[PDB]
Amino acid sequence: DTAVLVLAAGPGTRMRSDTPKVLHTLAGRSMLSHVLHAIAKLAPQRLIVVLGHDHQRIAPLVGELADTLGRTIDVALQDRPLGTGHAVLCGLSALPDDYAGNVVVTSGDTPLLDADTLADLIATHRAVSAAVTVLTTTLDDPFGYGRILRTQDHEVMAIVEQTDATPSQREIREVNAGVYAFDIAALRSALSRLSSNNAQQELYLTDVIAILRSDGQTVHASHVDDSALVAGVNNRVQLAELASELNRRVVAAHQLAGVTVVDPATTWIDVDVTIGRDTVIHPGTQLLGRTQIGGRCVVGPDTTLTDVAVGDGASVVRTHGSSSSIGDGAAVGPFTYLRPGTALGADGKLGAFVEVKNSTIGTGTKVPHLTYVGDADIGEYSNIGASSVFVNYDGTSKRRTTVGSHVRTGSDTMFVAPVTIGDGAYTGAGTVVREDVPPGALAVSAGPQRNIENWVQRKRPGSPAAQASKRASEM
Amino acid sequence: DTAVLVLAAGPGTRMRSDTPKVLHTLAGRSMLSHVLHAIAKLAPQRLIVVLGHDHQRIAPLVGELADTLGRTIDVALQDRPLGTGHAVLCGLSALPDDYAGNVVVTSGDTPLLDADTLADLIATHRAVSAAVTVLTTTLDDPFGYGRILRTQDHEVMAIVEQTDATPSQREIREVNAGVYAFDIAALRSALSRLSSNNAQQELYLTDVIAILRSDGQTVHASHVDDSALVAGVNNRVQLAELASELNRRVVAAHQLAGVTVVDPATTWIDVDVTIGRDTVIHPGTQLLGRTQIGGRCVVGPDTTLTDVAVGDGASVVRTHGSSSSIGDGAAVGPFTYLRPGTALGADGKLGAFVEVKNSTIGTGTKVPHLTYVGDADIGEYSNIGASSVFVNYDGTSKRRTTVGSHVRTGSDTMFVAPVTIGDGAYTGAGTVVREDVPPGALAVSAGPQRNIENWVQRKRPGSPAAQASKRASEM
Amino acid sequence: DTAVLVLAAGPGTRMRSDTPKVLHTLAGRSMLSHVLHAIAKLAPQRLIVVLGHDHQRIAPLVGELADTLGRTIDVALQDRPLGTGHAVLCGLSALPDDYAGNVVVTSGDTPLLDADTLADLIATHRAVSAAVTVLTTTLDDPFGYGRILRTQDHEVMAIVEQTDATPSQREIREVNAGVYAFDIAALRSALSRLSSNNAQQELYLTDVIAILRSDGQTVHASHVDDSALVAGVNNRVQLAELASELNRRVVAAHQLAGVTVVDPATTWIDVDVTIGRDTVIHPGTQLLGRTQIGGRCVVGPDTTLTDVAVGDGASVVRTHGSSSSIGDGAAVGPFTYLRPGTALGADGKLGAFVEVKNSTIGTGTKVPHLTYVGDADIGEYSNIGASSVFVNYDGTSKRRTTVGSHVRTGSDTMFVAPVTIGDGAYTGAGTVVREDVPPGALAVSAGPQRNIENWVQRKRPGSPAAQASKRASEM
Ligand SMILES: CC(=O)N[C@H]1[C@@H](OP(=O)(O)OP(=O)(O)OC[C@H]2O[C@@H](n3ccc(=O)[nH]c3=O)[C@H](O)[C@@H]2O)O[C@H](CO)[C@@H](O)[C@@H]1O
Ligand SMILES: CC(=O)N[C@H]1[C@@H](OP(=O)(O)OP(=O)(O)OC[C@H]2O[C@@H](n3ccc(=O)[nH]c3=O)[C@H](O)[C@@H]2O)O[C@H](CO)[C@@H](O)[C@@H]1O
Ligand SMILES: CC(=O)N[C@H]1[C@@H](OP(=O)(O)OP(=O)(O)OC[C@H]2O[C@@H](n3ccc(=O)[nH]c3=O)[C@H](O)[C@@H]2O)O[C@H](CO)[C@@H](O)[C@@H]1O
Ligand SMILES: [Co+2]
Ligand SMILES: [Co+2]
Ligand SMILES: [Co+2]
Ligand SMILES: [Co+2]
Ligand SMILES: [Mg+2]
Ligand SMILES: [Mg+2]
Ligand SMILES: [Mg+2]
Ligand SMILES: [Mg+2]
């Protein structure tokens, strides 16, 4: 039986942010969401999140996550950030007085911590009958971590904080993860003995190690070799470092599953994204939120998609797109903008300098060039001519437009919504369509061409164009 | 006298691909092409590629490469992938029974192997009179490689595979490259003694080392310090790692030759690309296939060019382009798409939101804005006005259009192919050109402007525009 | 009292450039500017730059920097590049014969050298009463650096150049920074004893170490642990390596100050750029020259801005822009090009496939799609319809256009400069505006739509459009 406490009530001042630290994101989830997902998978009997100033801004997000993960998550409040040891005291207050399960503690700023690591911790703690088991790792750069102090026979004696450590203790590269398992009576007893006479004037959870050792209680350190899983994030430098590591792991998982990622270093993939076999992702690409890409696609370079579904065999190149679907075999890009509600059918095409918003575009239909399609429904196997605009907006209002199948509209056509263009209709180049066009009708509005002979000689006399028409006249 | 065998008949299952492993690419060539280029330069008397299931999909590519490299390359078939030792047996079958040259063996998945490394191997093998000389290297991460086992006086005893090695042998960081030279009689004798009682149930080439040592035959290991040259690719993670290393080497060669590459990490350059002195390449750029860039150019950021020739002093910025030429001093981008058959003359300009396909554009001509130029020939020193379209396609058909020199066409002109615009002609803004325009003529079609006074007060009563025309009326 | 000499008169042949080596840039400044900024902050009594062939191309840049930094900087000429020791001789020639201050020497190709490092050097030199104090560091790859030779009790004996060192001395990883402090009499005495019998046939400054040791003079080495601060740049590979390191440091400083930089590896920030709290920078972004970004902005991905000011809460996404201002809360991108002189007001919008040049755009005004705005002034809360062009240029000439506030212009409107559009006016879709439009007028020019019934059956008989109008006719 285990209760897990997540300490998320510190001020987060080193982030230098007006957004609460635990709400900063990597790979499409906040640090707090990563931590609560990992813990939820372990499925402890109790899950308590300690929150501080704000709490009004974080507790709702906690309750949404409890619903998503299908379990209750209690919030305990810590009124002032008196230190990690005091935050654990506040967390214990959400437990019955008589609670007898183990207590696991972790921080809200260790976002790569996983279920397996927690399960190993609990298993080790139970096996050695420890009063306290602390996860540790070894780092090239241990700055800012609590240093593990061992006796000559390698017994863990104490954890010393960066601010409290001597220059010589600072050289210690074995560090405290800040993930612990405790015997609850031993934890309560040690917490009642903390004092705050240290460099930060705080009540440090870390002092419990030395306090329990004082009592001749069993103190066990469990070394996590994969240091990233317990790396902490106190500032934005560490956040981006850990985001980069998580992203390499996500990309690698896709590569081992059959996805070619040309340049993992410049390919950002959020945790919920799925990608089919033999897709190729080119450099400079981000796949974000719940994007799903099918098999044998080509995506990128320089593509950003958030919540976009892409079928099999599609090409989505130099495209910026959100909340849209792209059908099997469709071709999007280069230089294409998809705004929410865009649905392009199979074997559709949206080409360069095209923007679509809130429009459905049927199977095999092509909008190849320099056009804006807004609030419109277009049928199958139609062709929209270059440099056209679906005019939704009359200065105050916005309306719908329907274009049928096998239509061929001429370049530079403006469709002033709402209008209906019937199946197989055409429009001339340069048409302003303000009324319905029957099936198989040709709609036109451009006036006839008139040539004004020798205009250039008269109105641009002695210009390079005048000399040129003169020169062409002679030869 | 030497025969080289390339083993390329394994299933490649760890790639999780429907494309044969040896056909996956880096820096513009398949792994197999890289390996056969390296070997061809060494110029052995015989070159035999062992192929498996598929072979129908790979052998043609081999024959194309034989023609390109100007030499014969024999294919030997291995019907089932019974292991590397069996693949060598199959390869030997393409040699005469009485063959007496050395036999060199390498894999199709070691794509950075170079001619010099092979020549050193053969030279070392001949010098020590070895029965077998095996290339080895030392790696931080030796996962998946055969481990080199040495006696106490550092004699090579055996190679143990990742799957067959003990936890303690797995700690060995000296690894088998899988590149060997053999005395042929000794190779044939050892291969006849292989058995498949191991963790993979395969006939391992690697066992020949221990078998030859058994016979008191000379076994020599030659350590390659530059580990990348013998790194292998069994999955897409390793493929992208080795692609990134190869790319750093290609970029570095350009930098040492006089090319500024601002960010090598985000600048991908294929092996056949050439780049002139004092060109600057900005981040996020890929130069692919047979692209050639001249001297003093500026390329990028965010440019992708495949088979594009760019002259000296040109700027090609945020451009996506293929099978096109860009003249000396020309300016392309930002946000410009070049499709195949685009030829832009010296001091030409193709600006933002411009797409060109299959068009020739003469010296000094500018197409600066929001325009599509398809299937058209344009002369010298002409100016195409913003937001124009060369309409090639009439719904069923596509035709040509010719525009002369020193022409100035007005914004929003549509050129309905085929039409000819003579030298020094002009078009008005908003013209639809459906007929020829003589030299120095002005072609027009837009109707006259009419102002409807107080329309906004009548039809948008109490709108912010109505209040504003009211307010401007008073003051 | 101290005089600093910067040696910048070598040929720079390893750069393979027609641009003088010390003029190559990183993070928005030349190597020479970085070095003179660092030295200027230290504020020595004398600052002398030794220049060579060229000097005509570099000395003006030196004088501009002297004015900027508010101090004199003397140029000494070295006619031929006879070596670093000869360049110091030439530099001393700009000092009085009787000069008694310390002499500090550094190269023009050590561009991360900082004021603190120089101040520590001078402080150490004075403390130990050294004749010569040389800065050293230790490197994994010491190729091309002078190697530090020490006796058995760790006394510095000599510096040996890469070209002159034995294979075994080349293994030495402690290297000469080429930054020194000297007692001036001891320096002059040692320089008069240099000879050029070495591998480069040059007069090496580095020999002064052994010469002074000969005289039993005090020689002190001061180890700089942060090796980047004294890394040198002899070729473009080293230049990009040091640019990447400097850039990581600049980015890190922003992150610690409150800026989220999602991907430091692909975010290039020049030294003079400022960025406000809680701004987020997305991958693939360069912020260059004197760009200033306010707080809570979103910038990128794939954005390049040079000398662009962006207010607070603005979004500037996939934008390529220079010498422009973007107001508070404004939205720019994706796929937007800003040319110099663009000023967008607060809560303005410039959307996809929009280019602006030399135009002012007032508070709350939107230019959302496919439009070019050149040489124009637009008022507040106006809306420019999609696919429009401000036509500045009549084939020979360019003029102004003024658009008032609360105007709503129709899609596909061409504004033939110069024209004035009054407050609250409208234009129809497809209008060519060649004359002034009063406040609250509606300007139009497009002809009426005509539908030609059954045109497709007659002129595209048996086409998929004809069959479709037939099929829609029946059902
Ligand atoms: C004294 C202590 O515990 N130090 C550990 C803490 O350091 P570190 O300095 O990182 O501690 P933080 O300030 O980040 O606090 C840890 C967590 O506790 C929460 N919090 C903090 C103070 C408070 O009064 N209330 C509260 O709830 C924070 O929100 C954070 O999630 O984590 C590091 C691992 O990442 C360990 O190496 C350190 O040994
Ligand atoms: C048993 C063996 O040789 N192991 C070596 C092989 O491991 P590794 O596990 O990489 O071996 P692969 O499966 O990649 O086989 C090597 C090559 O032989 C070909 N192939 C394989 C099986 C077959 O029946 N037919 C065939 O032609 C494959 O196509 C590939 O090109 O290369 C590594 C270096 O990269 C070495 O460290 C290993 O010691
Ligand atoms: C002989 C010498 O000094 N070697 C040092 C020099 O090597 P390194 O080979 O880098 O020397 P450079 O050729 O780069 O010369 C150093 C500087 O002196 C200037 N210059 C050079 C030659 C000349 O005749 N006139 C002149 O003014 C160059 O412009 C450059 O700024 O710097 C390295 C650190 O970066 C040190 O490890 C080397 O020990
Ligand atoms: Co922390
Ligand atoms: Co392999
Ligand atoms: Co028009
Ligand atoms: Co140098
Ligand atoms: Mg704190
Ligand atoms: Mg296998
Ligand atoms: Mg138009
Ligand atoms: Mg030199």
Q: What is the DSSP string of A99-123?
A: --SEEEEEETT-TT--HHHHHHHHH
Q: How many Å apart are CA B133 and CA B316, to the nearest integer?
A: 50
Is residue C287 within 8 A of residue C273, CB to CB? The reply is yes
Is residue B279 within 8 A of residue B267, CB to CB? The reply is no
3-class state of residue A283 by DSSP: coil
DSSP state of C40: H
Joined together, the tokens standing for residue A60 give 């709702």
3-class state of residue B162 by DSSP: helix
* Residue C32 Cβ < 6 Å to ligand 3: no
- Distance of alpha carbon C112 from its chain centroid, rounded? 15
C337 to chain A, any CB pair closer than 8 A? The answer is no
Q: How many Å apart are CA A265 and CA A245, to the nearest integer?
A: 10
Q: Domain A1-258 adopts which CATH fold?
A: Spore Coat Polysaccharide Biosynthesis Protein SpsA; Chain A (3.90.550)
CA A335, A339, A340 angle in degrees (round to 5)?
A: 150
Going by C-alpha positions, the residue among A279, A342, A283, A341 that lies closest to residue A315 is A279
Joined together, the tokens standing for residue A390 give 């679906």
* Residue C175 Cβ < 6 Å to ligand 3: yes
Q: How many Å apart are CA A308 and CA A321, to the nearest integer?
A: 7
Class of residue B204 by CB neighbours under 10 A (exposed 0-12, middle 13-18, buried 19+): buried
Q: How many Å apart are CA B24 and CA B36, to the nearest integer?
A: 14
Expressed in angstroms and rounded, the spacing between residue C388 Cα and the centre of ligand 6 is: 9
Going by C-alpha positions, the residue among A193, A197, A199 that lies closest to residue A164 is A199
* Residue A8 Cβ < 6 Å to ligand 1: yes
Is residue A85 within 8 A of residue A203, CB to CB? The reply is yes
Q: How many Å apart are CA C434 and CA B410, to the nearest integer?
A: 13
User: Ligand nearest B429 Cα, by number?
Assistant: 6
Q: CA of B181: how far to CAs of B33, B126, B160, in Å?
A: 21, 9, 19
Going by C-alpha positions, the residue among A227, A219, A229 that lies closest to residue A124 is A219
Number of Cβ within a 10 Å radius of residue B162: 16
Closest-CA residue of A relative to C278 is A17
Is residue C124 within 8 A of residue C133, CB to CB? The reply is yes
C402 to chain A, any CB pair closer than 8 A? The answer is no
Joined together, the tokens standing for residue C162 give 């890469």
| Omega of the bond leading into B301 within 30 degrees of 0 (cis) | yes
**Resolution of this entry, Å:** 1.9
Q: How many Å apart are CA A286 and CA B272, to the nearest integer?
A: 29
* Residue B186 Cβ < 6 Å to ligand 2: no
User: Ligand nearest A232 Cα, by number?
Assistant: 1
Joined together, the tokens standing for residue B409 give 């066409």
Going by C-alpha positions, the residue among B289, B319, B236, B260 that lies closest to residue B13 is B236
| Nearest chain C CA: its distance from B248 CA (Å) | 10
Pick the CATH number of A259-447 from 3.30.1300.10, 1.25.40.80, 2.160.10.10, 3.40.190.10: 2.160.10.10
Pocket test for ligand 2, best of B30, B31, B107 (most atoms within 8 A of CB): B107
The approach used to solve this structure was X-ray
User: Phi and psi dihedrals of C466, rounded to 5?
Assistant: -60, -50
Q: Where are the domains of chain B?
A: 1-258, 259-447
* Residue B404 Cβ < 6 Å to ligand 2: no
Q: How many Å apart are CA B154 and CA A244, to the nearest integer?
A: 41
H or E stretch at B2: strand B2-8
According to DSSP, the residues that pair with A367 across neighbouring strands are: A350
B198 annotated ligand binder: no
Is residue A111 within 8 A of residue A28, CB to CB? The reply is no
Q: How many Å apart are CA A417 and CA B220, to the nearest integer?
A: 81
DSSP state of A395: S
> What are the helix (H) ranges across B179-225?
184-191, 207-214
Number of Cβ within a 10 Å radius of residue A200: 12
DSSP state of A393: B
3-class state of residue B380 by DSSP: coil
Is residue A3 within 8 A of residue A74, CB to CB? The reply is no
Is residue A330 within 8 A of residue A317, CB to CB? The reply is no
Q: How many Å apart are CA C350 and CA C366, to the nearest integer?
A: 6
With b meaning 16 or more CB within 10 Å and e meaning fewer, what string describes A35-58?
bbbbbbebebebbbbbbbebbeeb
C161 annotated ligand binder: yes
User: CB-based contacts of A40: which residues, under 8 Å, 6+ apart?
Assistant: A47, A69, A71
Strands (E), C151-213: 156-160, 174-182
Ligand 1 atom nearest A85 alpha carbon: 3
Joined together, the tokens standing for residue A363 give 């199977």
Q: How many Å apart are CA A150 and CA A156, to the nearest integer?
A: 4
Q: How many Å apart are CA C22 and CA C239, to the nearest integer?
A: 11
Give the residue, by CA position, lying nearest to ligand 2 atom 39: B146
Is residue C212 within 8 A of residue C132, CB to CB? The reply is yes
User: Ligand nearest C144 Cα, by number?
Assistant: 3
DSSP string for residues in B321-358:
EEEEEE-TT-EE-SSEEE-TT-EE-TT-EEEEEEEEES
In a mutational test of the A interface, the residue from B335, B366, B406, B460 whose CB has the highest number of chain A CBs within 10 Å is: B406
With b meaning 16 or more CB within 10 Å and e meaning fewer, what string describes B385-395?
bbbbbbbbbbb
DSSP state of A410: P
Q: Do domains A1-258 and A259-447 have the same CATH topology?
A: no
According to DSSP, the residues that pair with C135 across neighbouring strands are: C222
**In chain B, how many H helices and how many E strands?**
9, 38
B83 annotated ligand binder: yes
A372 annotated ligand binder: yes
H or E stretch at A468: helix A464-474
Q: How many Å apart are CA B394 and CA B415, to the nearest integer?
A: 12
A112 to chain C, any CB pair closer than 8 A? The answer is no
Q: How many Å apart are CA C288 and CA C320, to the nearest integer?
A: 11
Joined together, the tokens standing for residue A342 give 């865009």
> What are the helix (H) ranges across C257-325?
none
| Omega of the bond leading into C418 within 30 degrees of 0 (cis) | yes
Class of residue A236 by CB neighbours under 10 A (exposed 0-12, middle 13-18, buried 19+): buried
Joined together, the tokens standing for residue B72 give 């014969």
DSSP state of A229: G
- Option in C261, C264, C396 nearest A463 (CB): C396
Joined together, the tokens standing for residue B296 give 């003093």
Place of tokens 């009642």: A192
Place of tokens 């700089």: C224
A263 to chain B, any CB pair closer than 8 A? The answer is yes
Ligand 3 atom nearest C8 alpha carbon: 29
Q: CA of A11: how far to CAs of A6, A14, A81, in Å?
A: 15, 9, 7
Going by C-alpha positions, the residue among A331, A281, A88 that lies closest to residue A186 is A88
User: Phi and psi dihedrals of C470, rounded to 5?
Assistant: -50, -60
User: Phi and psi dihedrals of A357, rounded to 5?
Assistant: -140, 125
Joined together, the tokens standing for residue C22 give 């010390």
A456 to chain B, any CB pair closer than 8 A? The answer is yes
- β-pair type (B442-444, A450-452): antiparallel
According to DSSP, the residues that pair with B443 across neighbouring strands are: A451, B427
Pocket test for ligand 1, best of A107, A172, A207 (most atoms within 8 A of CB): A107
DSSP string for residues in A321-347:
EEEEEE-TT-EE-SSEEE-TT-EE-TT
Q: How many Å apart are CA B117 and CA B17, to the nearest integer?
A: 30
- Distance of alpha carbon A36 from its chain centroid, rounded? 16
Strands (E), A318-418: 319-326, 331-332, 336-338, 343-344, 349-357, 360-361, 366-374, 376-378, 383-384, 389-391, 401-403, 408-409, 414-416
